Amino acid sequence: TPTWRVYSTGSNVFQTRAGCLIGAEHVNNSYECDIPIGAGICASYQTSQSIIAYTMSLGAENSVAYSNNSIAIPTNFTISVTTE
């Protein structure tokens, strides 16, 4: 059907170690994963609107500024309650 025809052609193709997913967009950014494909490459909807695939991000980069002699004490405590 001419509706399957758009999903075999076009300029929207991004080869991956996973495969040749089409109907996507390989943006240069990195976000947290959503629908997981494989070999990192994740995909999700966004904002004018289109499924994007992105090299997933593991988290915000931190650096516990540790010196050689500085200890850090917590000075207030929040009692959470979690579920399992």
Binding site: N69, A72, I79, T83
Partner: protein
């Protein structure tokens, strides 16, 4: 007490809300029911296959064929059905093994995180496990955990020991945190800090070995005021 209470109370309120509106966090309980229903459903649907015979109805095979052969078609159906039953029971066994695992895990998690304050990190819940609470659920159990989560830092500057009278006084229960100015308050995990009497310290050795010692005074709470 009140300010700890308030937290506890409000937070229980959240546990409700996060499991009250429509955030489906009860996925793990739903999956079991879904899998079982699917298995039974497939087992029932398997009755509409003829496994290579003329039809899948027993009353139909007898009414169009003669018993010399009929046995072959019948045996075909028999074999097919039998295999299906085998598959169902085998997958049931395998799933039952997993449910048994999950059980034993839970049973432990009970004993420890509900009849005790088991320490082992991330076996009661993120943080330190103050206490817990069990709550039963359709075909399963739901644990609530009440934990201790530190926040709001202070990056002070510690030392390792305090040499005062040519001898090295190591810290008893805290990690001596000489805050910026008067280098001697001796804390403990939280922040309450007090002055270094010779009762939150314990003397040991001489002031050359533990590298990093920083001298000042270790106060003695006995002599210089009650000299009568």
């Amino acid at each position: 007490q009140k300010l700890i209470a308030n937290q506890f109370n409000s937070a229980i309120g959240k546990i409700q809300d996060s499991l009250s509106s429509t955030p489906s966090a009860l996925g793990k309980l739903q999956d079991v029911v879904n899998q079982n229903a699917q298995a039974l459903n497939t087992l029932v649907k398997q009755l509409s296959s003829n496994f290579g015979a003329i039809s899948s109805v027993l009353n139909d095979i007898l009414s169009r064929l003669d018993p010399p052969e009929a046995e072959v078609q019948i045996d075909r159906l028999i074999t097919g059905r039998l295999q299906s039953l085998q598959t169902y029971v085998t997958q049931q066994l395998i799933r039952a093994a997993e449910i048994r695992a999950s059980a034993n895990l839970a049973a432990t998690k009970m004993s420890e995180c509900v009849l005790g304050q088991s320490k082992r990190v991330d076996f009661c819940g993120k943080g330190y496990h103050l206490m817990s609470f069990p709550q039963s659920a359709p075909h399963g159990v739901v644990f609530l955990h009440v934990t201790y989560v530190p926040a709001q830092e202070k990056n002070f500057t510690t030392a390792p020991a305090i040499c005062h009278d040519g001898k090295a006084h190591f810290p008893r229960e805290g990690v001596f945190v000489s805050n910026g100015t008067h280098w001697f308050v001796t804390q403990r995990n939280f922040y309450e800090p007090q002055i270094i009497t010779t009762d939150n310290t314990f003397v040991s050795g001489n002031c050359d070995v533990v590298i990093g010692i920083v001298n000042n005074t270790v106060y003695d709470p006995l002599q210089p005021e009650l000299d009568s």
